[PDB]
Symmetry: D3
Subunit: 257 residues, 6 copies
Amino acid sequence: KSVFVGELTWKEYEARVAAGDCVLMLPVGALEQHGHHMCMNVDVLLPTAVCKRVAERIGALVMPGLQYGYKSQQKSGGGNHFPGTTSLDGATLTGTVQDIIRELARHGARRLVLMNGHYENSMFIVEGIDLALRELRYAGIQDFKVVVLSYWDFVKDPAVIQQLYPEGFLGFDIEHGGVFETSLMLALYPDLVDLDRVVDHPPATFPPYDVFPVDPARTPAPGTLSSAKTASREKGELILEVCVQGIADAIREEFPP
Amino acid sequence: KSVFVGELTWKEYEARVAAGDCVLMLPVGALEQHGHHMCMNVDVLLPTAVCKRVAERIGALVMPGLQYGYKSQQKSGGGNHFPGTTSLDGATLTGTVQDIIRELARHGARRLVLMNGHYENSMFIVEGIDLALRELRYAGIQDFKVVVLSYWDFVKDPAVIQQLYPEGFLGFDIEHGGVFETSLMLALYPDLVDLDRVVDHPPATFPPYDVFPVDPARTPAPGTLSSAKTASREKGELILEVCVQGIADAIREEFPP
Amino acid sequence: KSVFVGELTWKEYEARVAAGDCVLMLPVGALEQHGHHMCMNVDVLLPTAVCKRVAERIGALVMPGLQYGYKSQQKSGGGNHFPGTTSLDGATLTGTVQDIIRELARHGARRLVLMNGHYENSMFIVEGIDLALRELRYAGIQDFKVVVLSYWDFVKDPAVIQQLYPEGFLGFDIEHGGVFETSLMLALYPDLVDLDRVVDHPPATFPPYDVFPVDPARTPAPGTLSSAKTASREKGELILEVCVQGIADAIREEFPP
Amino acid sequence: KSVFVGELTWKEYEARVAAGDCVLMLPVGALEQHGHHMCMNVDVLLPTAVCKRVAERIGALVMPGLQYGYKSQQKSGGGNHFPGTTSLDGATLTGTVQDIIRELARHGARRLVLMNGHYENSMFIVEGIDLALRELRYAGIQDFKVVVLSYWDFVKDPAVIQQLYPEGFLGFDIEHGGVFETSLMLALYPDLVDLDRVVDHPPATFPPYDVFPVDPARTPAPGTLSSAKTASREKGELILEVCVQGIADAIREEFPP
Amino acid sequence: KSVFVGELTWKEYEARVAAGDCVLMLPVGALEQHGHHMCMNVDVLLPTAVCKRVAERIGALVMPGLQYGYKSQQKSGGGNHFPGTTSLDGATLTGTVQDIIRELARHGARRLVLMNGHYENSMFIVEGIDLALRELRYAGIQDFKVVVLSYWDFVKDPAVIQQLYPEGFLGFDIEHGGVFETSLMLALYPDLVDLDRVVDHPPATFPPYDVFPVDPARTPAPGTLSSAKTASREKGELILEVCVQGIADAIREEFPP
Amino acid sequence: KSVFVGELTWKEYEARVAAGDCVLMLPVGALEQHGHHMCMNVDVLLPTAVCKRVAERIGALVMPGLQYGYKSQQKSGGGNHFPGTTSLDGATLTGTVQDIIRELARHGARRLVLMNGHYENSMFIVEGIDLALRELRYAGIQDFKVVVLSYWDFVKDPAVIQQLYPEGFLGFDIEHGGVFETSLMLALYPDLVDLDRVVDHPPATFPPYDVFPVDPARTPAPGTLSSAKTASREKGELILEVCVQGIADAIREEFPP
Ligand SMILES: C[As](C)(=O)[O-]
Ligand SMILES: C[As](C)(=O)[O-]
Ligand SMILES: C[As](C)(=O)[O-]
Ligand SMILES: C[As](C)(=O)[O-]
Ligand SMILES: C[As](C)(=O)[O-]
Ligand SMILES: C[As](C)(=O)[O-]
Ligand SMILES: [Mn+2]
Ligand SMILES: [Mn+2]
Ligand SMILES: [Mn+2]
Ligand SMILES: [Mn+2]
Ligand SMILES: [Mn+2]
Ligand SMILES: [Mn+2]
Ligand SMILES: [Zn+2]
Ligand SMILES: [Zn+2]
Ligand SMILES: [Zn+2]
Ligand SMILES: [Zn+2]
Ligand SMILES: [Zn+2]
Ligand SMILES: [Zn+2]
């Protein structure tokens, strides 16, 4: 009926897990400012959309996504001084991932794909996985396998990059509310993007270090780390296809039928 | 426009908070089995739906809802031994609520309505609020106000109850996947309900005590605590309006514009 | 000798546990204001007294009671803003329950009755039990059984309620320092109750929601949620025999020799 | 007319704290094996008894005692491998002390005397105090003062030691269930002591290091670290009076009127 | 005398802090496998050596370094399945950083440079800083400034990269026990590096995702992610001067006299 | 050729552990003021020096030492109000010890000697050990043995004490920056001691209780608890050999081949 676990009855879910090779996917996002031109739930919407499409291709199921993520960092997300951005402490995010894995194992599930959509989440997701696997080991369970990834890492083909950045690629480091996400949003949730509001400032540049308390003067006023002026639905559809295809293939490789 | 914070840009959010009487609403649900006839994200869908309607009428905003809640208890949700049900440890839920309040305070927001949709969440939501307010006090903030409630508590009117349970009301204690929720779902998400699957068993009853480890034999096989056979969109619509109107008035009273 | 573990030598205790079917009882109370007419250790004294009597009747033992419980809530205990009331954070209470169960398992005990006397403790006791049972499982122990209850839940019989509330029962929700506890104290510790100090105010009434920071104005001045003016030692003796008999029978059922 | 906070109404407590010079005392014990001749709640009973007598002489109030303490260590309490002994994890004890100090400060109290009765508790009580004071500081409170002491430390005077130990004193290192404690119990709770069970074994001695997992063979079979055969009521009455007087003086010195 | 705080008397340290503009530097490393050719304390030795030289150049002091860091990750450090590697859980590392910052603030210090030498530590160092700064804020301190950096990030000049990697720079992703660290060790601790033990395997290549439990088969047998065959003392001297010069300038900029 | 794990390659370490009888030693110190005449890293340097010499004699290996320890206490370290002293919270130190033991067990190691050099660390090291052993049990490991000791406890022989304190030994209670440690430092790191700066003040003494917030006036201005004027290299060389020999024998006794 649906690839979303939340829309299934427990009997339907139980039956899918009973199959023996059931793959579950968990989107991990954040509520974070994304400039003057885009909504703040982008980091949840994108990995969730990708999960949905991948799940439909490989016959997987998608768990409710984590709506709040780790604190936004200046050099990757603009900084946690912006209003709207609502961040969790590291222990909180870590504990959430850990609890979910513990429960999935209780269900009998043994295959999980954690799809991150918020850069800063990475290491806390990692600690959550480790702490959960540690407990499972104490419970005599060592066959639970986890694949963790950030969907954008699948866009590495030079050909695609050239098509996405005709004037050259500066790296994902400045991709917060920039061309990459804005394009994907234009292809998935266009009504949540107001391109005319984009502030066309030069790419953010930082020295090889970080400063705390976060200094607002060091992040472009709009919150974006690069201009999304050249973003488009076409680019978004290209990104989506590349991500969906590459991830579906990776999951097939790691969790063969 | 949208009443969902996640769909706003940080500038739009900032402007609403800048108004001075901005009311924020946070749905807190769970992924929990709800019988053979209904999906598992009910505890998220319902309080979120009520929040949306209330927010539209009073000019409030709704934060992304918490998808996972505390462990299901036998006497209220059937028990955490059911597959599908994916629960958090108490410290995790408490920490999530606490972090969000801390961040909302940072934004300059001072009015929050926590709408619970999962009975078992209550005390951990309470602790999250207390710990957060304790920190705000240390930070020199004492004007942050929180109103917490479970939407179903607003169905008090005997006339309404009579209209909802023409055969006599047995209490909310057995209302897990029963008439109350099923009726709401029939009016909001009919495609996520199939009354034909309803197992018409007698209302669950228990002795005045609890037993751990949870014993599956003490919970009706389907997971429901009462039959939803008499559920109807009509009953659902009545319930919805009653809750929306009552909650809207409660908020107008506690957070006068 | 005694039914109190603290009054036994480790040799005696060891011998009792060696019986193989030894039942242990742990009272969990609190230090909380109980109006102008009763002392603040009521939530410890009452469950302890019930445990003592039940333990004597069925041959069980009683562990030292927890003297401090979770934060008093307005709608059930008046609120944590009252002086005298000395509350623990949830993690502290949960951890205390968890540590004790771990230790009892180490002793070889496998049967525990947790008798709550402070309404607000419930869910934290529940979490303590779950976390402890989780650990025991990792330790290879799955035969530890726990029965958790609040002594007042055993007073259900309409004929009993009738005698206790001839003018009509309004529910346990207003029973903080009211007729129920005051009657029990009059029968158990008359010297710690001064009925002449009772403030006969109308029953506390609240809207279908909760407000934080707790608003002192919403709780009856004396701290009571209802008047104990009609309390009596005779009503207390009835309540005691009903609770002792009901609980004793419950334990015989769950923990047969 | 009680010195115990638990036996006072919140109004009586409030009035005493309103004096502005109220001294509060918190007994901290443990449930620990104490040989074949004595009960296990000794570490709670003694400091409580001393607190009662001191409070009566200086006009102080006594808080409910902590019934469970830190894990028993071989060289001082016999070891945590003994049945009956029910110990808390360090974080639990620390958190308990921290929570109480926070609440007492909320009451407006500013003078606390923690009376330890279980040697192993010391450092966790210290951490609890430090964490609480750090927190009070954030709340703008720096006038909260705490005095921590173990009643036995007030038995210094060689003259007194002479009477207690004629054949020479050997330090409190082996004073667990020995002459010192048994004598106090014979004077306070003789019904909880049976010298006819005292195993007259040689004083326990250990190498200059500790071993974990704890080795049972390194602790005298009885659980005691020294024989209490020569214990007596007379000796107890001596110790008691010396401790009560000495401690009362110290409190008058630290919390001068 | 020495730039190491540990080798100063508390009087000397106090005098330096009393200067009002004293900069403290804290090396954060790890105990981790570094192939067959280098010792396991490299992540401590390197940042410490850089701090030493930077401190001497701009007159700062160096705090004792953190010897244990976060769990080694496959794609960055080879994996935590290797023997020798001794890692801390995230909460432990975060808490250590938090504690030290709190203490330095107590000293009156307000300038800190956290120099990371183990890639995986980064986000836990960040959380330590945030939690510590949050507390300081509660204490009324908002003038404590922190500069966090990984020393290798200062080697970015194209001309410098060309010299170090004439064949072509493949990126820092594969720099664990490779050319970069080995060259530095050759120049700083030649006796702890045996280049003749280097296993000249192809650069480690990984798909755009991570797998847990870590699969030993996915990491080159030696533990290195790239061959240090072309490492040299001369390349090390170049890296050292670039790092020391770049970092010293950064500190002069962020912490002017 | 090195006894330090940090200076070994993972292969060398692996080989030593593969033997099956490898003994590991973990120095646990602190950064703490030690008067006007000595450096602050003393508590790390001494236990480490002893570990090195013991390891060389019995064939053990020395892990990187813990540089930061628990808060300094007035009666033993002068107090945590002194500048320079940088202390961890109890949970942090406990967690660090716990994580290391967990990792060593993962390596296959099963014999650990924890050598404390900072008195105040004791109980938190104990808790870390207990929590780790508890975890190991859940993992099916019960053959991990730990020996905890403070190197100064092996210096008790009257013949030795006589030479060290020919004028009378007052106990280790006042041994903070006194003759004992200063003598060891004069023998191991004379450059880190300026005996001319010693403040020949009378031995510190305190009432039989503690006060918090710590009162500065109760600690000798210098920070020392006893004058080290009597210190000498010869005395240190005596202590060193005594400890090294005693500890080596103790280890041979507990971890026999
Ligand atoms: C830099 As991002 C995709 O977490 O906004
Ligand atoms: C008892 As319910 C509304 O949380 O499923
Ligand atoms: C509501 As009550 C029995 O915990 O005071
Ligand atoms: C050594 As004791 C007084 O804590 O039993
Ligand atoms: C990748 As590294 C410098 O932490 O070994
Ligand atoms: C009393 As000490 C050796 O920890 O300074
Ligand atoms: Mn993001
Ligand atoms: Mn529910
Ligand atoms: Mn109560
Ligand atoms: Mn004891
Ligand atoms: Mn590393
Ligand atoms: Mn020390
Ligand atoms: Zn984003
Ligand atoms: Zn529901
Ligand atoms: Zn009560
Ligand atoms: Zn004792
Ligand atoms: Zn490295
Ligand atoms: Zn020292």
